[PDB]
Amino acid sequence: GGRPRQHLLSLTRRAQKHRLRELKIQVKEFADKEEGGDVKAVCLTLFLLALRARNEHRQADELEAIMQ
Amino acid sequence: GGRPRQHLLSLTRRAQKHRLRELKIQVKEFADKEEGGDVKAVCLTLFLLALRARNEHRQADELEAIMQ
DNA sequence: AATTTTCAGAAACC
DNA sequence: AGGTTTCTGAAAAC
DNA sequence: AATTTTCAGAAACC
DNA sequence: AGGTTTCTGAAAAC
């Protein structure tokens, strides 16, 4: 069997980190090979584009206001 | 040769989208296989954890204030 | 609106 | 002139 | 602080 | 009791 997974956003940062770990690595590898190891800018843009792909322009704008 | 790349954050959303495209796919695949296709929550958490991994807790808190 | 791929052309490099 | 890759936008499709 | 991997135990499933 | 995977935190290292 195995313990059922909780939602990612309900987990401790610790447990969150443990689940994304394998993707965190893929992102790292990509950031290095293609974007000069700029994980922040990559994940930021992934998220922003992910928001705008959903027409959550208001939040996307607000995060953009936060980041400069 | 080839045209030199601009910084990801200076590009049009169009051009940004074109560069991350290959990683966008990897994220999609991961989100589907491991997080019930919840790209938003994945990228959000990747970014949040990426910020806190850099002790940018203030911004991380502010994005967390935005998202609920 | 968004998405996607295709077609074009200019721009920046060789 | 040619090459290339990147950037932009439009175009034609979902 | 952060990171990492290791060790533990409890928790939730079979 | 056993199994498993997940979650949490501590522990020992950078």
Give the nearest partner residue to B45 out of A20, A39, A42, using CB atoms.
A20
CATH of the domain at A29: 6.10.140.510
A57 interaction partners in chain B (CB closer than 8 Å): none
Distance, Å, B14 CA → D9 C1': 9
Closest CA to A8 of B26, B60, B38: B38
Residues A59, A51: contact at Cβ < 8 Å?
Answer: yes
Residue nearest to nucleotide C1 (CA to C1'): A55
Residues in CB range of B27: below 8 A, 6 or more apart: A23, A27, A46, B39, B42, B43
* Structure determination technique employed: X-ray
d(CA A40, CA B46): 9
Query: Nearest-5° angle of CA A23, CA B50, CA B64?
Result: 110
**Listed resolution, Å:** 3.0
CA distances from A5 to A2, A11, A15, A27, A53 (A): 9, 10, 11, 23, 27
Which residues, 6 or more positions from A35, have their beta carbon under 8 angstroms from its beta carbon? Answer: A41, A42, B8, B19
Q: Is the CB of B14 under 7 A from strand C?
A: no
Give the number of domains in chain A: 1
SS (H, E, C) A44-59: HHHHHHHHHCCCCHHH
- Give me the DSSP letters along A20-33: HHHHHHHHHHHHHH
Q: Is strand D less than 7 A from the beta carbon of B21?
A: no
Q: Which of A17, A20, A34 sits opposite B42 (nearest CB)?
A: A20
Q: Which domain holds residue A56?
A: 1-68
- Beta-carbon contacts of A50 under 8 Å, excluding residues fewer than 6 positions away, are B39, B40, B43
User: Does any strand D atom come closer than 7 Å to the Cβ of B12?
Assistant: yes
Cβ(A39)–Cβ(B23) under 8 Å?
Answer: no
